[PDB]
Amino acid sequence: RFPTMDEYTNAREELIGSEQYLRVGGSINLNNKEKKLNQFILREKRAIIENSRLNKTQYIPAVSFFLSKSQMESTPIFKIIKDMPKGAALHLHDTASARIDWIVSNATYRDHVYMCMDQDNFVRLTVSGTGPPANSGCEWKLVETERANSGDIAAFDHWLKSNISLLTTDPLVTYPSLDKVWGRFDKHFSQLRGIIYHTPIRRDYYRQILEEFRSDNVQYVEVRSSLSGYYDLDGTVHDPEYGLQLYKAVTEEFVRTYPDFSGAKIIKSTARVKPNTDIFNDVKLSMDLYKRYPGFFLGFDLVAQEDPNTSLLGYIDSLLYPSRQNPPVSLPYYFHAGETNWQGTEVDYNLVDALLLNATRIGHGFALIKHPRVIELVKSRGVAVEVNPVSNQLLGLVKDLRNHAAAPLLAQNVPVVISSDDPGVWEALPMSHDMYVAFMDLVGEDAGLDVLKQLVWNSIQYSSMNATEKKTALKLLQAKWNNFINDSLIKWKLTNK
Amino acid sequence: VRFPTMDEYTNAREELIGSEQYLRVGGSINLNNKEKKLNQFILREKRAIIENSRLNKTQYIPAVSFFLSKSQMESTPIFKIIKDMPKGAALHLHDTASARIDWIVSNATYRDHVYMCMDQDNFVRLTVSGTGPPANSGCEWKLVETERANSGDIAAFDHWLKSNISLLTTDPLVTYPSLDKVWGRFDKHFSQLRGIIYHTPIRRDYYRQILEEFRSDNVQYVEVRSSLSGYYDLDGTVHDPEYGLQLYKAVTEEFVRTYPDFSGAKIIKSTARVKPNTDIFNDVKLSMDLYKRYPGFFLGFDLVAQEDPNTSLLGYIDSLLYPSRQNPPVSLPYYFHAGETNWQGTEVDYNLVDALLLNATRIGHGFALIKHPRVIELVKSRGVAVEVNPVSNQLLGLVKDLRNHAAAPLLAQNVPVVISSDDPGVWEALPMSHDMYVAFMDLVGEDAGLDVLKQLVWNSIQYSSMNATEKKTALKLLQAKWNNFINDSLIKWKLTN
Ligand SMILES: *[C@@H]1O[C@H](CO)[C@@H](O[C@@]2(O)O[C@H](CO)[C@@H](O)[C@H](O)[C@H]2NC(C)=O)[C@H](O)[C@H]1NC(C)=O
Ligand SMILES: *[C@@H]1O[C@H](CO)[C@@H](O)[C@H](O)[C@H]1NC(C)=O
Ligand SMILES: *[C@@H]1O[C@H](CO)[C@@H](O)[C@H](O)[C@H]1NC(C)=O
Ligand SMILES: *[C@@H]1O[C@H](CO)[C@@H](O)[C@H](O)[C@H]1NC(C)=O
Ligand SMILES: *[C@@H]1O[C@H](CO)[C@@H](O)[C@H](O)[C@H]1NC(C)=O
Ligand SMILES: *[C@@H]1O[C@H](CO)[C@@H](O)[C@H](O)[C@H]1NC(C)=O
Ligand SMILES: *[C@@H]1O[C@H](CO)[C@@H](O)[C@H](O)[C@H]1NC(C)=O
Ligand SMILES: *[C@@H]1O[C@H](CO)[C@@H](O)[C@H](O)[C@H]1NC(C)=O
Ligand SMILES: [Zn+2]
Ligand SMILES: [Zn+2]
Numbered sequence: 001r002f003p004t005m006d007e008y009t010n011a012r013e014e015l016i017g018s019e020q021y022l023r024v025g026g027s028i029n030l031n032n033k034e035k036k037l038n039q040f041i042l043r044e045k046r047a048i049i050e051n052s053r054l055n056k057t058q059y060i061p062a063v064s065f066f067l068s069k070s071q072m073e074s075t076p077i078f079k080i081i082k083d084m085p086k087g088a089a090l091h092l093h094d095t096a097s098a099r100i101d102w103i104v105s106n107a108t109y110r111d112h113v114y115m116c117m118d119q120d121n122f123v124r125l126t127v128s129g130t131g132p133p134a135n136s137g138c139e140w141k142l143v144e145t146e147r148a149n150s151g152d153i154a155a156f157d158h159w160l161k162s163n164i165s166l167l168t169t170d171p172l173v174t175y176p177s178l179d180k181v182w183g184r185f186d187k188h189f190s191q192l193r194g195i196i197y198h199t200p201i202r203r204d205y206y207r208q209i210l211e212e213f214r215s216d217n218v219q220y221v222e223v224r225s226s227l228s229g230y231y232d233l234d235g236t237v238h239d240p241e242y243g244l245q246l247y248k249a250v251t252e253e254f255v256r257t258y259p260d261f262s263g264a265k266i267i268k269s270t271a272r273v274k275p276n277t278d279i280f281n282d283v284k285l286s287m288d289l290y291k292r293y294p295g296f297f298l299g300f301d302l303v304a305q306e307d308p309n310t311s312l313l314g315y316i317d318s319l320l321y322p323s324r325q326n327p328p329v330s331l332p333y334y335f336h337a338g339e340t341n342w343q344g345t346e347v348d349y350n351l352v353d354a355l356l357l358n359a360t361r362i363g364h365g366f367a368l369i370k371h372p373r374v375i376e377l378v379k380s381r382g383v384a385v386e387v388n389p390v391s392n393q394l395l396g397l398v399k400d401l402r403n404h405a406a407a408p409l410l411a412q413n414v415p416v417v418i419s420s421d422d423p424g425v426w427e428a429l430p431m432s433h434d435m436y437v438a439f440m441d442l443v444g445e446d447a448g449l450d451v452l453k454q455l456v457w458n459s460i461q462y463s464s465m466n467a468t469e470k471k472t473a474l475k476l477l478q479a480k481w482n483n484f485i486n487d488s489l490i491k492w493k494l495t496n497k
Numbered sequence: 498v499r500f501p502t503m504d505e506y507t508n509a510r511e512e513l514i515g516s517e518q519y520l521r522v523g524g525s526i527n528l529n530n531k532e533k534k535l536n537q538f539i540l541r542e543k544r545a546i547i548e549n550s551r552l553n554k555t556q557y558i559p560a561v562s563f564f565l566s567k568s569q570m571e572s573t574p575i576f577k578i579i580k581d582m583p584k585g586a587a588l589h590l591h592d593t594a595s596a597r598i599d600w601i602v603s604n605a606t607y608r609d610h611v612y613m614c615m616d617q618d619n620f621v622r623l624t625v626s627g628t629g630p631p632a633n634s635g636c637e638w639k640l641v642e643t644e645r646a647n648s649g650d651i652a653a654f655d656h657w658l659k660s661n662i663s664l665l666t667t668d669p670l671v672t673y674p675s676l677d678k679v680w681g682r683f684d685k686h687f688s689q690l691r692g693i694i695y696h697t698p699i700r701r702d703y704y705r706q707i708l709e710e711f712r713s714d715n716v717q718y719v720e721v722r723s724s725l726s727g728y729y730d731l732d733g734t735v736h737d738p739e740y741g742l743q744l745y746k747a748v749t750e751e752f753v754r755t756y757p758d759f760s761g762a763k764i765i766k767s768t769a770r771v772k773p774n775t776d777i778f779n780d781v782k783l784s785m786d787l788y789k790r791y792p793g794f795f796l797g798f799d800l801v802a803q804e805d806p807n808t809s810l811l812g813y814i815d816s817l818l819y820p821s822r823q824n825p826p827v828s829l830p831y832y833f834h835a836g837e838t839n840w841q842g843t844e845v846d847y848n849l850v851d852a853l854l855l856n857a858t859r860i861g862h863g864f865a866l867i868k869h870p871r872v873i874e875l876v877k878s879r880g881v882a883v884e885v886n887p888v889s890n891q892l893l894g895l896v897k898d899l900r901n902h903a904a905a906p907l908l909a910q911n912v913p914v915v916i917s918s919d920d921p922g923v924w925e926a927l928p929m930s931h932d933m934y935v936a937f938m939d940l941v942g943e944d945a946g947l948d949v950l951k952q953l954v955w956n957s958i959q960y961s962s963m964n965a966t967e968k969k970t971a972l973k974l975l976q977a978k979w980n981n982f983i984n985d986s987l988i989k990w991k992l993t994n
Binding site: 001002003005008011012015016018019022049053054056057058059062177178179182307308313316317320323324328341342343344345347348349352353355356369370371372373374397398399400402403405407408411412443444445446447 | 498499500501503506509510513514516517520547551552554555556557560675676677680805806811814815818821822839840841842843845846847850851853854867868869870871872895896897898900901903905906909910941942943944945
């Protein structure tokens with residue numbers, strides 16, 4: 001009943017307003033300084049969207065990261081997000097979270113590093129103190145010699161980087177299927193496995209994760225790591241507790257050096273390709289490290305490609321073992337779950353088992369929007385979904401990022417944290433690229449700084465810090481946020497707006 | 498301990514999965530024993546194709562471009578069962594795009610006074626002129642009869658005409674790899690046929706071919722969008738919209754009298770949303786008048802043409818609110834295309850808010866609906882069926898992998914949905930069987946079978962605009978066709994025992 005345009009406007013704005021309040025960040029009340037920055041962001045967002053829509057050209061924030069990376073980095077919204085404190089990156093893999101450039105310019109300049117071209121014509125890297133490795137399907141050569149004989153060291157080093165990065169070409173073009181791009185992604189890890197498991201390189205690589213994340217204004221990380229098998233020049237192989245202690249010592253020194261950094265905690269990950277009887281041992285291992293490293297060791301996760309490998313149900317007696325002890329042991333789980341386009345299959349039904357197993361957070365949950373009951377359990381229990389949008393695009397779940405299945409989750413205020421997954425593999429920053437695409441593609445044109453602030457706060461509030469640590473971290477984050485707001489008003493000439 | 502045994506765990510697991518099954522489209526259907534026999538065969542076939550794709554790591558063909566999947570699906574049991582299955586109704590169709598290009602070629606371009614030219618973009622155009630060739634405005638018109646006779650190869654000439662008009666000659670996802678490019682090609686298709694298909698005897702016979710083709714795909718009823726206006730005779734006489742409506746009414750009545758196994762057709766007036774508000778106002782008043790004087794054949798009004806770059810519903814709001822604001826009010830039903838977009842928080846997807854505030858009877862596409870939880874509530878509460886056209890949404894740029902189709906989460910929440918084909922003539926689809934196949938294989942899960950199909954089929958009659966008497970009669974008819982389909986299928990697939 002709209003006799004005049006005012007009654008129609010009022011009902012229209014009431015319904016739209018209800019959705020805006022319901023979505024992520026909708027209950028935030030911005031202060032006056034925040035509002036001025038918010039209005040600039042919203043003007044910028046409308047300008048790029050309206051140009052795409054009305055001038056009938058592609059929306060760059062939603063195309064392949066290969067194409068959009070160099071375009072977004074010059075824009076004001078990206079520069080604001082780059083400067084913004086992120087809080088925490090809660091979904092990361094320890095052999096994929098520092099720069100390939102550091103592997104090349106630092107690790108492959110160390111003594112005793114070898115390279116070979118494998119039968120698929122990819123370079124592999126490893127360390128051997130005890131002579132060159134055996135020619136098992138590839139001929140190892142000392143990198144120092146190959147580089148010194150290249151006749152162009154800059155080109156040699158660039159070739160190493162180009163042969164290892166997944167962003168050398170557009171993966172959506174070069175590996176145009178799920179199985180092809182996962183073939184390339186699995187190959188990347190095989191290329192670096194040898195060098196990245198040598199103990200002093202692994203130690204320093206982990207330190208580089210912390211340096212790079214701090215440099216992108218991330219103050220805290222939770223990292224998945226397999227922990228085991230770091231090896232020395234003399235061939236000594238270390239156990240998982242040693243690997244955990246190695247990370248603990250690096251983290252403590254880093255936080256000593258940088259008290260503006262909250263620190264790190266570690267999740268043990270095992271590949272879901274192994275027999276149940278081996279997963280059982282890794283569950284027992286995790287129960288032990290959880291008891292003896294409280295507050296640094298968080299719990300357990302299963303990784304490797306979800307679709308063709310073993311389901312959570314395929315491991316259910318291992319995963320139920322802690323809860324079944326007398327007295328029960330509660331081993332926290334952080335399951336990767338539902339990282340798939342399938343529906344009604346044992347892959348997306350991993351989400352059901354993740355909830356039945358009391359997962360603390362869920363990795364990806366791309367299939368979650370197809371499961372209305374699992375959504376309601378996730379919301380009612382406060383189980384944060386770790387959303388990694390660049391990863392999901394480049395690794396084959398979606399092409400146009402406005403079709404990312406987390407957008408309907410955010411619209412319902414499902415608890416979500418943004419993370420980068422494997423940023424080093426495809427040359428992403430620790431958080432700013434993923435936060436930009438989440439901001440530009442997974443929420444709407446009228447969604448501004450309140451969404452960003454809520455996602456940032458979510459990454460601490462749904463971290464696995466204890467309550468006291470969260471309060472301390474939020475105090476530090478609030479000071480970072482206030483500086484970011486003031487700096488941004490000056491930088492974007494908004495102060496009198 | 499919550500799950501001390503496997504039976505305690507599977508009990509909880511199956512109750513949770515079962516409760517989601519009860520909540521999706523078709524989840525309340527109880528199949529009888531014959532239907533269960535066919536359902537078990539369908540589910541075995543569905544599991545075989547999905548598990549092969551998943552475990553043998555190869556593309557899921559039902560979800561790839563229609564250009565690639567069409568020939569592969571047609572040889573499979575599931576497609577052949579859907580082909581035989583009664584579809585109920587196609588509720589979302591456009592009258593100049595719902596019969597075969599082959600008929601335009603083999604019938605329409607063999608008629609007297611048909612001319613062709615190559616336009617400046619190098620596409621063939623077709624028109625009719627009773628007074629010699631038309632003015633050569635931007636192309637040189639030639640008589641088709643002469644060109645065909647001088648072609649030197651008549652079959653190749655006719656095949657070339659078809660190949661120059663169809664969007665499935667090449668894969669649109671490859672040849673027109675952006676929204677603007679493929680909508681450019683799509684707009685061009687209509688320009689190519691516009692002249693010939695607005696000539697009155699051709700337009701009449703083409704509309705008859707829509708009814709014959711849909712009947713042949715076991716569709717018993719259609720509701721069709723039509724602009725209704727501008728049909729023209731050999732001597733240049735141009736008819737008004739009421740004449741177009743009467744012409745369709747006569748063709749429909751003759752068809753139903755010939756084929757009692759066919760329920761019939763009703764018409765929705767469409768206007769392109771590139772026009773000034775003064776034009777839409779005139780077409781709203783025309784629709785008010787046709788609704789009053791052709792009850793039960795003229796249904797109401799819709800706005801068409803590409804949604805993203807053109808005028809919003811709010812841009813016409815004074816015209817659209819005019820019927821309700823009369824004294825006494827006149828209730829002009831609306832069937833708005835709405836939210837056919839990847840945009841979020843913009844003028845375009847917010848058309849969904851206005852469509853509901855204006856009391857739409859059904860909404861076309863609603864691709865953006867899953868991003869609008871408060872609109873979803875109204876759609877469910879009011880029983881506003883969403884017309885889902887999956888092949889159209891893929892080929893015209895909203896999605897690549899159809900498992901990412903935004904209607905899959907709608908179906909999982911039991912949003913009222915009907916499947917339709919939109920413009921099947923344009924890209925060589927069947928009236929319903931291809932779209933029902935991709936909906937069944939991509940938009941619901943591995944464990945969703947004959948109950949989903951049956952519900953979608955019943956929905957298309959239940960959410961039609963038939964009156965109470967017609968609907969009861971049509972549902973008895975549909976039940977009869979369905980029983981014959983189940984019995985025939987048990988024999989054909991050798992499922993009886
Ligand atoms: C990794 O490095 C390979 C060795 O250079 C490279 O091999 C070829 O394909 O690269 C050239 C094209 O860039 C081509 O001219 C050479 O003939 C190839 N070299 C050999 C020894 O076969 C691979 O393509 C690189 N792979 C990636 C993914 O970058
Ligand atoms: C929509 O329908 C309601 C309920 O029938 C009615 O009261 C209202 O006037 C209608 N509004 C319009 C704009 O037609
Ligand atoms: C479209 O582009 C032109 C120039 O290329 C520009 O003037 C115009 O404002 C653009 N429109 C929008 C809405 O950005
Ligand atoms: C690599 O990093 C280490 C430790 O961070 C540093 O001492 C060294 O200078 C760098 N380069 C190499 C080749 O070791
Ligand atoms: C899950 O959590 C609930 C409440 O926290 C607890 O009672 C239950 O036993 C837990 N289940 C498992 C499998 O650990
Ligand atoms: C995978 O393909 C092989 C043939 O190469 C076949 O034997 C096997 O059954 C397939 N597996 C599945 C799960 O379809
Ligand atoms: C075209 O269809 C019309 C109308 O049914 C029919 O009379 C005519 O014979 C057809 N032309 C051809 C070549 O079949
Ligand atoms: C249409 O025909 C012309 C002339 O043969 C040809 O060059 C052109 O590529 C064709 N276009 C399409 C889209 O098939
Ligand atoms: Zn991960
Ligand atoms: Zn349509």
